[PDB]
């Protein structure tokens, strides 16, 4: 059973056992100067932004963006599962210009990305909405350990004892990294509030000037209502052993503020007190 195993430490971070087993392959990953890296803590808008980028690269052509599932169009680099997937191999075999997905903390990113001075798009989301999304994802995406109850999972998240480690360190260190490398640092809530503005930021960062009509095509096709029903974007083509959408769909709610439906008032107050302590050494500002 490749599924439901305990996480394994890799350089201080809990990762899937099979990533740890194949870590040298990830560490030695060969980036290319024109790669665009999409980097996120899990559940922060990775799929959304990956689809936006693929739409940009295909000039808004919806059919071209249905050439394969999102997880093949934009490989999850470090995800290697015996018999099932190998993000490193998928990328090695992909013609440029590549779009690369990672969830690695800054300090674990393969050094080739730095040496190639790649452009990186980092997406962050408010911690309370992330932990809710992650709870349901742990349930449906069987590679994860059992999350336990919501209470148990919330405590594990606050302690950083979840896949890819603590949210707090992830977002803070990637934020600091923007001073060293070209990192467009975006917020899920901004994309919710004004997606046109945020896609324009992506276009500027990519040094692309496209017609308004193409921008509007990209906007339309990257909305939640469209993506949730799109089998090339909604993970429903995933092998059933890997993801059970009957437990929770990948495209679950796609809102900001679902935390209010999940947190008790006491959990919220406790989470906030803890949050303030952890985030005091960072300029970061989030909206819930
Ligand atoms: N086009 C879109 N607009 C808004 N949210 C989207 C979206 N596509 C995916 N999402 C949401 O992004 C989260 C998945 O993030 P990731 O791609 O990083 O795993 C899920 O959040 P919820 O579980 O809160 O609904 C999912 O519904
Ligand atoms: O984004 C992810 C994080 C962790 C595991 C995943 C498995 C499949 C597809 C996406 C995943």
């Amino acid at each position: 059973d490749v599924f439901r195993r305990e996480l394994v430490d890799v350089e201080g971070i809990p990762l899937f056992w099979s990533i740890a087993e194949h870590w040298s392959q990830v560490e030695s990953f060969e980036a290319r100067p024109d790669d665009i890296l999409i980097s996120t803590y899990p559940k922060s808008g990775t799929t959304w932004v990956s689809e936006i980028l693929d739409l940009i690269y295909n000039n808004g052509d919806a059919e071209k963006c249905k050439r394969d599932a999102i997880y093949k169009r934009v490989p999850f680099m470090e995800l290697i599962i015996p018999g099932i997937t190998n993000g490193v191999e998928m990328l090695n075999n992909m013609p440029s210009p590549r779009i690369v997905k990672t969830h690695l903390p800054v300090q674990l990113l393969p050094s080739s990305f730095w040496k190639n001075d790649c452009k990186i798009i980092y997406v962050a989301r408010n911690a309370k909405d992330v932990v809710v999304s992650y709870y349901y994802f742990y349930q449906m995406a069987k590679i994860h350990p059992e999350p336990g109850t919501w209470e148990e999972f919330l405590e594990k998240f606050m302690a950083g004892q979840v896949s890819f480690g603590p949210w707090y360190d992830h977002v803070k260190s990637w934020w600091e990294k923007r001073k060293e490398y070209r990192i467009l640092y975006l917020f899920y809530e901004d994309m919710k509030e004004n997606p046109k503005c945020e896609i324009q930021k992506i276009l500027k960062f990519l040094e692309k000037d496209i017609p308004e009509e193409i921008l509007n095509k990209i906007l339309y096709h990257s909305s939640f209502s469209v993506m949730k029903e799109n089998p090339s974007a909604n993970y429903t083509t995933m092998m059933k052993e890997e993801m059970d959408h009957s437990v929770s769909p990948f495209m679950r709610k796609g809102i900001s503020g679902d935390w209010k439906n999940q947190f008790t008032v006491a959990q919220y107050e406790k989470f906030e007190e803890d949050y303030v302590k952890k985030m005091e050494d960072s300029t970061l500002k989030f909206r819930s």
Side-chain angles (χ1 to χ4, degrees):
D1 191 6
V2 305
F3 306 108
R4 291 290 191 230
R5 305 204 192 175
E6 304 303 320
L7 298 162
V8 174
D9 182 276
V10 174
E11 303 185 21
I13 304 296
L15 300 183
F16 304 134
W17 70 274
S18 48
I19 299 178
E21 171 169 290
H22 288 274
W23 187 241
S24 64
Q25 186 172 162
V26 181
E27 290 175 296
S28 61
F29 182 74
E30 290 180 61
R32 300 176 194 163
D34 65 342
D35 284 344
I36 297 299
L37 179 68
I38 298 173
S39 174
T40 62
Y41 190 83
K43 313 322 293 173
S44 302
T46 324
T47 310
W48 194 357
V49 176
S50 297
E51 184 75 351
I52 292 167
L53 267 290
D54 199 49
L55 282 159
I56 291 170
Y57 279 32
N58 286 279
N59 217 234
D61 187 319
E63 263 319 293
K64 286 181 179 183
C65 293
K66 291 173 178 186
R67 65 190 181 281
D68 216 333
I70 187 68
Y71 52 85
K72 301 189 214 168
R73 292 181 276 137
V74 177
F76 186 173
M77 177 189 64
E78 63 269 18
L79 187 66
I80 298 162
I81 302 169
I84 298 310
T85 191
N86 189 319
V88 168
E89 283 291 275
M90 296 161 72
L91 289 159
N92 285 347
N93 292 128
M94 176 170 282
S96 294
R98 305 186 295 191
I99 306 165
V100 182
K101 157 183 175 178
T102 191
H103 295 309
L104 292 169
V106 275
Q107 69 277 7
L108 272 65
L109 192 74
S111 65
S112 184
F113 291 98
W114 313 130
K115 293 180 194 188
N116 279 272
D117 194 26
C118 299
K119 289 184 184 172
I120 302 170
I121 300 170
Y122 187 82
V123 195
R125 180 175 195 193
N126 78 263
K128 293 192 291 295
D129 282 342
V130 166
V131 59
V132 180
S133 181
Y134 212 180
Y135 174 61
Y136 291 106
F137 193 55
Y138 253 66
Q139 292 185 329
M140 69 89 74
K142 301 312 180 63
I143 194 64
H144 296 94
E146 287 290 347
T149 63
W150 159 249
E151 283 69 29
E152 288 168 344
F153 184 78
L154 177 61
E155 287 294 329
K156 284 277 177 186
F157 177 97
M158 289 174 68
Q161 298 294 335
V162 290
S163 171
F164 295 100
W167 173 92
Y168 315 88
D169 308 33
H170 203 284
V171 302
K172 284 189 296 169
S173 296
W174 272 106
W175 178 250
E176 293 303 318
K177 203 77 175 176
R178 85 197 191 286
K179 300 157 174 179
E180 291 179 352
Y181 291 92
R182 298 173 293 175
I183 296 169
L184 178 66
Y185 198 111
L186 299 179
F187 297 85
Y188 179 100
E189 296 76 21
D190 293 342
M191 301 175 57
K192 283 296 296 180
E193 178 176 73
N194 195 336
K196 184 173 210 171
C197 174
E198 300 300 305
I199 298 177
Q200 289 172 317
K201 287 181 190 169
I202 292 168
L203 291 163
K204 181 168 201 58
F205 181 69
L206 296 177
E207 301 169 76
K208 289 176 179 299
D209 171 22
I210 65 172
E212 173 75 4
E213 287 175 34
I214 303 301
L215 172 60
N216 288 335
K217 290 196 72 173
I218 295 165
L219 286 161
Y220 179 79
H221 295 270
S222 61
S223 67
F224 183 77
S225 65
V226 171
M227 289 185 62
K228 80 180 309 275
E229 300 301 333
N230 178 359
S232 296
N234 69 5
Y235 279 87
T236 58
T237 62
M238 259 291 153
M239 200 59 261
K240 175 60 151 52
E241 309 60 72
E242 260 191 290
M243 288 190 186
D244 188 348
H245 297 253
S246 81
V247 171
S248 185
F250 186 97
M251 297 290 181
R252 190 183 61 94
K253 289 189 194 186
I255 66 177
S256 287
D258 194 45
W259 68 267
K260 294 191 169 183
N261 302 124
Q262 191 77 35
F263 278 75
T264 64
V265 173
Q267 284 163 358
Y268 164 63
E269 296 185 354
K270 181 182 183 176
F271 186 91
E272 293 306 307
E273 187 178 299
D274 178 73
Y275 183 94
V276 172
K277 292 176 178 188
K278 285 172 177 167
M279 299 298 283
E280 64 188 324
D281 70 346
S282 180
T283 63
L284 264 167
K285 279 263 281 170
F286 283 90
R287 295 190 290 165
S288 74

